[model samples]
Target chain A: MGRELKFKKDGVEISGYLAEPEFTKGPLVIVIHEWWGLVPHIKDVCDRYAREGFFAFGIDLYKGKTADNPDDAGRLMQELLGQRLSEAEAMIKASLDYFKENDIGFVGRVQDYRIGMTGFCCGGTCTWYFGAKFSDEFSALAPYYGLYSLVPIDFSAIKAPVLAVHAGKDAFVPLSEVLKAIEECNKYGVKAQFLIYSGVDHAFFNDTRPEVYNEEYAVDVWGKTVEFMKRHLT
Target chain B: MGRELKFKKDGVEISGYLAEPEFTKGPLVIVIHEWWGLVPHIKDVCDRYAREGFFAFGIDLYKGKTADNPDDAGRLMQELLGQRLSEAEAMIKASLDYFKENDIGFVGRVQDYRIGMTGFCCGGTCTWYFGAKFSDEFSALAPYYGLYSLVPIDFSAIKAPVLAVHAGKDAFVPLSEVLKAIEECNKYGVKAQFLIYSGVDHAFFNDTRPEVYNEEYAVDVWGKTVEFMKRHLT
Candidate 1:
């Protein structure tokens, strides 16, 4: 179960889905929604993370707008991309501040005063941008099916250890590109571990779409991610 | 475990992955791959079907060529669509004949001398085309996320009962259109049962793509499909 939380970023109001475990204290995991905005699927992901003993918050980048169709999602994503990170950066920063201020009291108890970040698709790209830009703020970074080429990320700037999951036959992001991203991370000594699932397509970790969803891979990657975060953040 | 099998379709050689249950006899299930061709995910589906006590086969529509990118898949699908029903119809027929001939002997012990059909996306559309075209050839039909509007089918001619799974928020196929299809099936006494999952996008049943995958819905839909098929086909 989760509830909605509102906070201000750059004087603009922002809201996100916050799900906390019954224990009240654990690692703070910032979940980012795909281009579809803050849909239930993203909330479910947050709830899952919370169940795994983490204080998870699924941030809504588009204020509250969600897309059900690719055309609309693409358009929304295009508009966001056109803005060039100002909105996304502000919203992410606000989420961090909101939790740090402990205004809600519950947000103050991150098991080890550490934070981890993860996202999917468009949100995955955001994970890369924010994880690298604010590397010092994160203990671990996990981006699923995000294409680094879409928005160049400076892997060298990343201080956090990265665990990236990618699909081998991704229709949108080629395997070559993901390889290049991993290479960049390595060259920059980011301690990145890229898990490129062979024989599966992009977004394979997504269990919602039957056309390209790979349940086995999704389970494996999720396990790896949790272990990575627990080991680092705890 | 599954193995590859080759069969003849209208003088052309066709191949598929066949997985049989440990039991000597079971229902026959034909699995059609998405536009991506007979990749591992589809093969895994066949294996899962076999594990459920069915003799499942994953058919390849694109000969041996599998697309690694959307552009290539688009072109391949365009070419296949250009050829239209002739190629798909012939291939399906050949798969049926191959199983009926019992060349493998193991395939001969179909529970009721009947077979079921299921597919995803493009393959889901193919399931509709073949299921309706050769109504008497199928015992049950289940097409996942296939838009009936993509191709017109004569519901009156369909002899087999249909269990169709649809995504309510499908970008490619509108819910209104899928509802219309169910209405047509009802009008024609086709005994169609459609499960349209709301709040989810197209290809939601796929576990590989996290962008649109819904594991909760996918698991539920799959359980329903297996029960539906067992009830009707067996």
Candidate 2:
């Protein structure tokens, strides 16, 4: 189980779910949530990341609001999208800054405490946004079914390698756009690989949805995500 | 105000808001919504387009769900994102087919009734996606503060001219990616123009929010959009 933690963004308090491995000498991974706000799914992803031997933090961008229905989730996501990026940027920065400060005696004491980021849906988009925008801070980025076209930062700035997973049948995002992201990243000298799963739809990794979840692909991607993180972070 | 219209996708019914000018012989424009689902703002844009002497339809991508908060919007968007592109393509195709059928006595009665597409934020990205995929169907494309970089389609097939409006200070999207999109468009021999508004953030055209809206830029871009549509559609 992860613990609840609080940090500040522009003097305002923000909360998140924090989980760590028994050995805290490894890197850190920032887990982002979908437009559903910081739900249990996101926290579970953080735990998974931590279990992979890295410190994981599921940062909350929606303050505290969450939703079980699509209506509320859409509204919450729009509110965040409706705002300036500075607010989101501030929250993300605060999360990293807080974690580093708190871990000064542990991972922070080491010089090469790398960082990684992952997310689902809206969170996946944010993962690419933050990973590229602050590439120097991240060692790896794995966004599961994130709409990469929604991320507007320059791929050239991304020092980290990106592993993006996509569904062939995604209604919201096009495969050409995913391929374009990798092409652009290559053009900018960043290493990027796209893992496309055919015959799947978006959010196939979510076990909660029986209608769309693909356990086979989900398990395979999870293993790949961890392997990619280890290759870079270690 | 627009009337609610329904269409078919994979044998399932999908709905949209349709508005038209009194003339009814003008071009058709498809309006897409942000990640917030088919909100009032999108409908307003369709109304504005109709008032500017065109038929405009605000398509609902999230089935019938809407969001008043970010969390709901995010979930709704994720749901849409989770579906397959074939679904969205079917909905769009049906919308156009219905209009062409209904207007057989009007614009469709004549030769070459042009069509255009426009959207904002998430909707904006969709505008580009559809415009590129269905290049032969659209006469012009305009996306307001859309993250074009997220669009993964090749521009070579986009026969329509593209008019992209971007905010210099957008927190959600980056300026570099916008420029890169234009560059790719040019490389592929597509006619594309990028309007960069200095110091404005994302959603700068939404008058609903006085804090983020830039009236001057908004007014200017609207005029440009109309002019672009006229040039291509006429």
Candidate 3:
């Protein structure tokens, strides 16, 4: 169940989806939405994490607006590109700080339980940026089919292990660049692993798109992503 | 990683597979093997649970022998029937007690984490019995296609939520009995949910058997089981 939550970050009213575990206190995972913005799928992703005993929160970069088609999604994504990190950094900081303190209202983070971050597509790229920018806040990061070219990010600053999952036939993000990105992680001594699911293209993890969605690969990668978090986040 | 462990439970040496999560403070999940005994598949299952940040242990009903064929597996399953509860109850009790203390030689359980149990086929039935018998030890139970006709036990003793998963065309356990068991759970006020995977037969979760294994359902159900544990075990 997603609890529509609103909190002030950087003096701006931020509204997002918070799916809580049945338990009072648990680990936290901040979910970023795809270029479609804070849509239902991302909320469901937060719910899924909540079912895994985590205090999952889905961040809204586009405030409350969402896109149902590719045309609108690209336009919104293009518009956000100018101030992506500038707008995002404080929002994430406020969200992370919100989890640390119990008096902030909702169930606070368990000090012992670690935090992890993950996202898909454009959100996946943001996962990399935020994980690097806010390395101390997260213990692990999983970016699924995210392109690094959009924003020049220093992968070396990432302290946590990053598990990059991509499709072998991703049209939006080529396999060559993904391998090179992983190679950069290796070169920088940042813990990283690259998983390329063959015969599938970009957005394979998006169940809404049957044209590219591969259930088998999506499920397997989901398991792997959760498993990766357990290894490092714990 | 799976640690080949031997612990004395009930004055009889209980040799079982222990897979530890990367971290020490985490939940515990006891995995029961199929009729084939403590095979590699079951060991891998234990590993998968470990990756989920659980201290996973696989129980061994048969001391050290394994079967590669149905005949031997059935024979082994048939032989173990007479003392399934008798031999199992003490082993499980010993294991639970072992987890409570810090002097078990290996990493002991984190007192905060609640325990969950899961099994396949014959092992699935054992999950039902153990969850009922050792009700206080387990917080949740997931029995996959286990038949209850072999041994008659009051389902009212089950204190935890049971996520019973079965195939619609199961040759061994009919859909009628599974529905009846769920009704029994309802009649006794035990928390339960039954998932019937259509167009598949018994042992559909077994990846070793290509004919029966449905990757889609298997992965989906695996997520469900893990999510179920998070809801109750936490």
Candidate 4:
């Protein structure tokens, strides 16, 4: 059966999903949630991991609490994000610990679990922060439109390969910022592959939002992301 | 009903899926594919759009073909994306033609139609480009983890609100890049919102890739994307 787990992060009971390959041993893949907190959609995604032969964990940063609506989501987002980045980092580490302690759950706990992390929106950004600090823990890293600041990143320290999915028509993120990041990655000799989708703004992966969701581009990105993950994470 | 209309761009007959919302009016959204070409997953997404009451089109950039597997996907990707930026642009324009011409199952024929383009990975990058160039045509733009650099993007040139979604711990995209994008958005005074998930890598949106998919993030991104579309695209 496909199911998610609940763990304690900073005394807050966080919920997540863990998937294991059927009758086979494979690496552990950690799934992160966006700012809206954990929901059914997240669990369904975790089930997919089970479908694939891997131990996948969808870690929730906001315990069992979720947003009532957009405004509520926004308010909860700020609180969950917190003023200090350390809080977020601590919570994530707790999730990782849960799996490490449970040999049957996490990818590495069972089969020399080559850990991998992936996220969307808020989760995407937080995963960016995770990349900087936990690069040594995982075999590969893939970010969907997630960004990190120069103030926090030390490119030379990362050990995993990176594959980035980005948008071209995004009004929120500027071209200059992404380029600068690319520049920094180049300086460190990191294998960074950045693919830009045309005409999309942000959150293009959500088929729920037909007004902005581009299935064609999402398919392409998924293909590329799967490729990169297979090469590095699996 | 899910179907695709094919058009020639640089001698390649590019195909795009035309998905109509069950009970919605006006403003069509175009979906661009990454490098994997048009696959079944992309079509499923289009079907989702129809269910959600929106007209969704999954545009194929790899002409009339698809990959059998990741390796095959990679080769097909190289063929289409490895050396065809101009062709990419042309395909996007042609997709617009499909919508404007109502060549498929589109019910409304309105140029005043608010158009939105979105996608994943490389396709997400396309979302930004098409939405920006045709700002007047699109009411909003959303792009998942993708590039923002395409055509000479002027901060002022972007006329639509953008939402950027990304994952953390991605091997491809770095925190530095995402941060820069946020900074650039602020500098340009663009209406933009950025979200990042924790512990997730690229392709977190797709449930197919269990290793990278996050269920919570997927739902959250969908809700957020819907909200954004309601705020701007609708």
List model 3 lDDT by residue over B59-91, tens digit each.
898878789899999888877767555776777
For residues A21-53, could you state the per-residue lDDT of candidate 4 as single tens digits? Answer: 677566667777766777766666666665766
lDDT of 3 by residue, A63-153 (tens): 7789989999998877765665577777888887777664321323343547788988888888998888887777878888888888876
TM-score of chain A of each: 0.93, 0.92, 0.92, 0.85
lDDT of each: 0.76, 0.75, 0.76, 0.66
The list of candidate 1 runs beyond 4 A from truth reads A103-112, B1-234
Candidate 2 residue runs with Cα over 4 Å from true position:
A104-110, B1-234
Clashes of 3: 0
lDDT tens readout by residue for model 2, A96-214:
77766666213444466678889889888888888877766777888877775554766778777677777756778775676567557545756555555554778988887798898
Instruction: Write one digit per residue (lDDT tens) for candidate 2, span B95-169.
Output: 777777776213454476688899888787788888888877887888777765444756777888677777656
- Judging by TM-score, tell me the better candidate of 1 and 3: 3
What is the TM-score of each predicted model, taking all chains together? 0.49, 0.49, 0.50, 0.49
lDDT, residue B32, model 4: 68
TM-score of chain B of each: 0.93, 0.92, 0.93, 0.85
What candidate 4 gets wrong by more than 4 Å, as runs, is A9-12, A104-111, A149-151, B1-234
Evaluated on CA atoms against the true complex, candidate 3 attains a DockQ of 0.02
Candidate 4 CAPRI classification by DockQ = incorrect
True contacts kept of 4: 0.00
Share of true Cα-Cα contacts across chains kept by each model: 0.00, 0.00, 0.00, 0.00
Model 3 interface CAPRI class: incorrect
Per-model clash counts, in order, read: 28, 25, 0, 104
